[PDB]
Amino acid sequence: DRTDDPVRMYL
Amino acid sequence: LRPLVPLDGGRFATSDLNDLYRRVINRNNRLKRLIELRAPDIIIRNEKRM
Amino acid sequence: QSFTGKKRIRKSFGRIPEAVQMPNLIEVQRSSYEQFLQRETRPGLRRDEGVEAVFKSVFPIKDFNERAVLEYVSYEFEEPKYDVEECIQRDMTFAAPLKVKLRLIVFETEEETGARSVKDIKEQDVYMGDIPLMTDKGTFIVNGTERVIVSQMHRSPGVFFDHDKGKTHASGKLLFAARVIPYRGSWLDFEFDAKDIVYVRIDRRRKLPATTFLYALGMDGEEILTTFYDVVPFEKRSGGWATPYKPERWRGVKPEFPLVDADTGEEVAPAGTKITARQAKKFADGGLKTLLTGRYLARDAEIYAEAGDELDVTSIQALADDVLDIDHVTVGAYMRNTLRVDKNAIREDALFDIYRVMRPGEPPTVEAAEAMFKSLFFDAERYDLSSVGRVKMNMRLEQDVSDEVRILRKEDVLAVLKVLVGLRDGRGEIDDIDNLGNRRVRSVGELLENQYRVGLLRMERAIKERMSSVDIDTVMPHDLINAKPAAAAVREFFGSSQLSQFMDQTNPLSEITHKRRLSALGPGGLTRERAGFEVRDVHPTHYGRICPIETPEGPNIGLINSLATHARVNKYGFIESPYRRVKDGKPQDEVVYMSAMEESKHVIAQSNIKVAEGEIVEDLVPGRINGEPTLLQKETVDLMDVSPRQVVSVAAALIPFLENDDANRALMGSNMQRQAVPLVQSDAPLVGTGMEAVVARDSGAVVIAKRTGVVEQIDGTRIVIRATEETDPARSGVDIYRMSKFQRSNQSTCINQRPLVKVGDRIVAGDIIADGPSTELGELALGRNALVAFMPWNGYNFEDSILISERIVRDDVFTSIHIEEFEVMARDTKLGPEEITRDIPNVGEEALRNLDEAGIVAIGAEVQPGDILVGKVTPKGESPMTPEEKLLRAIFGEKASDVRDTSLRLPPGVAGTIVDVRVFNRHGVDKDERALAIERAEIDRLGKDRDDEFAILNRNISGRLKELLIGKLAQVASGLWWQIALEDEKAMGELESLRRLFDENRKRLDRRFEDKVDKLQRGDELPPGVMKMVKVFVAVKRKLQPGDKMAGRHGNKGVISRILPIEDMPFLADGTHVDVVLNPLGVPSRMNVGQIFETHLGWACANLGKQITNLLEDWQQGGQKQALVERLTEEELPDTEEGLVELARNLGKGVPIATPVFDGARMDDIEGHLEMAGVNKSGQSILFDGLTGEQFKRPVTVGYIYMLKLHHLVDDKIHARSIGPYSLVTQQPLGGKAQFGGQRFGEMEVWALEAYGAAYTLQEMLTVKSDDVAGRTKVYESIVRGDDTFEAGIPESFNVLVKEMRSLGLNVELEN
Amino acid sequence: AELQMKHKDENGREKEINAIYMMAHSGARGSQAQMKQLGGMRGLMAKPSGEIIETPIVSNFKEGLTVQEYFNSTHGARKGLADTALKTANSGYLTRRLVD
Amino acid sequence: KVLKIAKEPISLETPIGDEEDSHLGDFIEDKNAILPIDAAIQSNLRETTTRVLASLTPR
């Protein structure tokens, strides 16, 4: 479930 | 250590360290403006994350 | 042979046929670029390559919001604005403006209507960014310095089956991984697991079972099992075990239970191969047998049947009130076992899992996940697979579908999985990645096409995003299109790219060997650090396709290999090699090019076979069936070698007497071949391989006649030729050829051409007229050759060095020419504009000599190192001065100037003379008060050449008119040439029809010259900052000095040692003396012997030339001399014309000998040649000692060896610095010989001082010399005063490091 | 044995000694394997896979060599050159690591 | 004056060479730094000015 993307988490 | 000496021809040449400091200052100013405007928690959270 | 071999006859050895000739060596780049740019009519331009390819790929830029589309019809190329001769001087970009016609009308309209409101299409022309055109040589001159693009070599976009050789595993086993690597798309893998489970990973993501990816497709349920494992029927619990079968699978199986027949006796106790059992079952009317508990029933089993495939206990439900065919000897249960490790059953589960693996950390949905999987592999634009990839996949796996589908077909994955499952158990062969059949070459065409496609995609996105704002209604084209949306993408390719590199224009050999290069790096290639050991190794399929002898011996070894002499490239991208087809016994005469992958299923026979009879009589010819060479018979021999010089490159082919030296040493000789600077007044080698003439005439370094007409006069700088002996009607008058004079090349070396024809001397079309740089009589040359004597001379040649005499420098045979071409700018400044002032302040009057009033040195003025070439002064702001300087200025009364001295000065060097100077002015002022005389001289020379060309053309016109009207008192009638002035008027029609063409040609010439003069007067363009620039073409005439690097024709090299006088050299018999003394100790160490045979053959041919030139000195055109000349030469030698005397003048310097690479002269041949020449059969001759006057008590070897002058000169290598400019942030001395560099004290050098007891030498050499800035001047002051002492407090690098560490959270504070 | 043999001249004194024999015996430049490959049979070449090819390369540098026997020598030379280029970096790394 | 704006200055870490080494930071000169030969000339001038100021009267 790890993303390592701020814009991805925001969207 | 992060010089901005102008090269021959009038075109400057700066180090890549200025970009990081400029981005940090811009994000800090944006967060400061967000905290004063009383924005929603969703926008203020993303600003702190960035 | 025509006008080239007649002047100089070159004997050839060996016995090899010359049926097929090698094509042009530069055909690769030209053929690759021609496919991209068609340059044909409108109905033409039909192919998969070129800008039209991408245009037809995505022509319509449609938007669903407004329903507007853009249609493509065709594109046209315009003429180039600037020619190459002016593009090289003006530093412009040689390219052609691209124009494409696009229609803005769209068929879609509002309310679902039909034709739009505007029935007539727009059909507007939109300008596009120009693309650089290819010169006839293939230079790709984008700027003042031409840059060629080397071809790239990468993996073919096909499926591969590579299994690791028991590595990266806990126990010894194989993985058998399969790849579906496409051309442009996400990669796919089907690697196995140690637990015998098939795992699939897309784009090297997290591994997951292949069952999920299979369920994601249409094949779901038991369809994945019915297609992988066969099903066998069984009876529903009959008497015993009645299973009707057949014996196709029972062959060679260990029976765990009694498999005897119900009615016959079979199934013997051993039950091995079961050959007799197989025959009995075949003759038993079937393989039915009578018989368990462990079976995975693959039947498509809700009321009674259930999911899962295993009974395993008692066969419950009484066989439910066709199970499987999987044994343990031939087939495995890997596919079945994979269905029990995955937890996903429904297709939605597999889609969600794939979406989570691709985009981690996001809530998956059925709508978004479906489009993601559809666009990942089943998308046209997202997943692109070239036609070569499809054909390779079809060849590896038969599919009968190619050139029509580009995306991954749903049936291909099942076939790949089946092939992988089959190869896992066995009965399969893996595919090596290093095989030449699995590697394709990407030339400039495909790379530029991909770049243009990316640019066009970006432009299409921009147009689609911009077309929504502007109202489409009541609009037109040429406005909703970015001016440079993709021109930058094509301009950056030639400018910055690992493939497109600088041109190595040092000699005619390097110009032809740099274009046939196959690099492996660049955008899409293995990095030098990621190469490994297998990529650098040579593969046995490179025979005749890639010469394994020309490769750089640096770090990137085995990655910059070039092609062979006969190797070609197919339309797909693979390398082709010619193979002469041979039938049973009798060899055919129809050579056919055999590809690398197709030649595997064939037999190859080597050349040099006895072909005296109709077929080879040996019956044991050496040939390689597939890779390894084994002695094969004469039966079914289908392919034969075309020529022995097929596996060697063009560079290695010039090495004479090859196959006699070591393979590694021959590699060094190839690199030294394309490194010799062109010498002035060079000659062809005495012992040549014959390939020099082809490489000289093929490369773009020599002029070649285009017609058959005779020459009129050779003015040295331009040669004129007549029309032709059979010229066409109404064609051009005469062909004028202007030979390029001394001009700076791309590597700072002189390049000039000299004529070779005389008055008359009718030449046939397609013949070299004037030789190029380092070429004489058409034959290629690299340097002069002198007599060599291998012997130690007082230790001067102890190590790998060379000793030469002063005779080689007295004649000026090894002297070359160089050009630096310095430049200077005149950019303005904020505090006033700069100016080219004639006099610089506080400068000496003597230093201003040889300087024009404008500030530029006159042409042909001798200049010394550290001289003022261009006097430029810049306005300097007011700065504070020390009080002592002010007091001195007030005492002397002089006034301090407000300008700074920034004039150009020559760096330390030879300081040659000036050749040419060019100045450019801005559009505001052009030739106002500077360089006015230069422009006047230029226009005068232009007018002079125009008048000369007009006069010669008018003379040719008068001659043609006279010879035409002679058929129907002309000398006393000068004005009647164009007017008959007689009753006859039949010839007047032809006279007018010829005069019209002559007048239009003259008008075209005048118009071209007027456009040239107008462009010259308009002024060249410059950057906005600069307003004036000057270029000085300083030239230096270097000579051979001690310390220079001189290498022979082979791998032997060595710096030239101290030159000795002519008398000190060894005094040979008859008064002659040697010129070079090489060390003979390099033969045992370096396994190369061809230099000795080359020296012997050179001595033999030199003796023959000396004996033949003396025969003609007695009486010219003697009958006996022709007999000897015909006897010594192997007969087209005698000529009825008077040119026999001219042939002797060239033969007097030694008769040329042409020896092939593999068919060279044997020992008996060279022995007989030496015997006929008059030299002793042993090859060695007695030599005296000139220094002492005594004869050595042993025979010595002397002969003529071909020597080269490498570019590693000593004047450009030496450098010394005392005090120069320091760094900016580190405050250390700069590096590199450009501007007063400092020799870097490396880390390993510091360990040497630490090994010794030296502690003060290393302490001051690191602090007071470069680090400390405060104490740096103290040591200099102490040295200038006379006291030796220094003080070092702390270096600047440590302070910088402390300031850096303090910037982070770490606290680095000093104590005590 | 044919090279080490000292020839006897008709006059009664040794005419001279061979050049390559002296260079190999002194140990300055010549060696045994080099002289063997120059005058001997050269043995058998090894392919890049690791095993030795079964074809006999019966020839020396003095006489001519066909392209087939030269291809294996080129393979071996390229393998040696690629091996010597990478092993030297490991030596430098080990030297830099031991000094610290 | 609108033209010649010098926008987007080149980074000092851009690799001048084709490879990764030989960055642009090395091919740069420091103008504010004074060479030691120039500073040595100043000491000589400062000392010679004191010796020359010895024959004049004290006033």
- Chain E partners (3+ C-beta pairs within 8 A): B, C
What is the residue-wise DSSP string for C197-250? --EEEETT---EEHHHHHHHSS--TTHHHHTTS------SS-SS-EE---TTS-
CA distance C923 to chain B (A): 19
Q: What tokens were used for B18?
A: 């200025």
What is the residue-wise DSSP string for C117-175? S--S---EEEEEEEEEPPPTT-----SSS---B-EEEEE-SS-EEE--SS-SSSSS---
* CA terminus-to-terminus distance, chain B: 26
Q: C1132 vs C369, C1116, C1126, C1150, CA distance in Å?
A: 81, 20, 9, 19
Contacts of B18 (CB under 8 A, 6+ apart): B2, B4
- Alpha-carbon gap, residue C725 to C763, rounded angstroms: 10
Helix residue ranges per DSSP H, C546-690: 650-653, 663-673
Interface contact B1-C1296, CB threshold 8 A: yes
Q: Nearest-CA neighbor of C5 among C738, C652, C692, C508?
A: C692
Q: Which residue of B has its CA nearest to A11?
A: B46
Q: Return the CATH class of domain D1-79.
A: mainly alpha
Q: What tokens were used for C675?
A: 């490194």
Contacts of C98 (CB under 8 A, 6+ apart): C51, C75, C77, C127, C128, C129, C130, C131
Residue C1132 burial by Cβ neighbours in a 10 Å radius (0-12, 13-18, 19+): exposed
Residues found in chain E: 59
Contact C642, C606 (CB under 8 A): no
Would an 8 Å CB–CB cutoff place B7 in contact with chain C? Answer: no
Closest partner residue to C659 (CB to CB) among D53, D65, D96 is: D65
What is the residue-wise DSSP string for C728-793? PTT--S-EEEPPP-SEE-TTS-EE--EE---SB----SS-B-EE-TTEETTEE--S-EEEEE----
Tell me the resolution in Å. 3.7
Where are chain D's structural domains? Answer: 1-79
As beta bridge partners, residue C340 has: none
**Amino acid (one-letter) located at C928:** D
Contact C687, C1156 (CB under 8 A): no
Would an 8 Å CB–CB cutoff place C397 in contact with chain B? Answer: no
- Chain B partners (3+ C-beta pairs within 8 A): A, C, E
Q: C1275 vs C1261, D75, E39, E44, E47, CA distance in Å?
A: 12, 58, 12, 15, 18
Cα dihedral C81→C85→C87→C88 (10° resolution): 170
Burial C678-712 (b: 16+ CB within 10 A, else e): bbbebbbbbbbbbbbbbbbbbbbbbbebebbbbbb
Residues found in chain A: 11
DSSP E strands in C675-742: the ranges are 687-688, 711-714, 719-721, 735-737
Q: Nearest-CA neighbor of C550 among C538, C540, C541?
A: C538
Q: Nearest-CA neighbor of C1049 among C1086, C1080, C1095, C986?
A: C1095
Contacts of C82 (CB under 8 A, 6+ apart): C90, C92, C94
Cα dihedral C738→C744→C746→C752 (10° resolution): 40
φ, ψ dihedrals at C875, nearest 5°: -65, 130
Kindly state the helix (H) or strand (E) to which residue C864 belongs, with its residue range. Answer: none
Residues found in chain D: 100
Q: Which residue of C has its CA nearest to E33?
A: C1222
Which fold, C817-934? OB fold (Dihydrolipoamide Acetyltransferase, E2P) (2.40.50)
The number of C-beta contacts closer than 8 angstroms across C and D is 120
Mode of pairing for the β-strands spanning C124-132 and C1028-1038? unpaired
- The three-state secondary structure class of C947 is helix
Would an 8 Å CB–CB cutoff place B6 in contact with chain C? Answer: no
Sheet containing strand C687-688, strands side by side: C11-12, C1153-1154, C687-688
Q: Tell me which chain C residues have a C-beta less than 8 angstroms from the C-beta of B9.
A: 825, 827, 1023, 1025-1026
Q: Nearest-CA neighbor of C509 among C771, C699, C770, C657?
A: C699
Contact C961, C993 (CB under 8 A): no
Would an 8 Å CB–CB cutoff place A11 in contact with chain B? Answer: no
Would an 8 Å CB–CB cutoff place A6 in contact with chain B? Answer: yes
**Amino acid (one-letter) located at C1077:** V
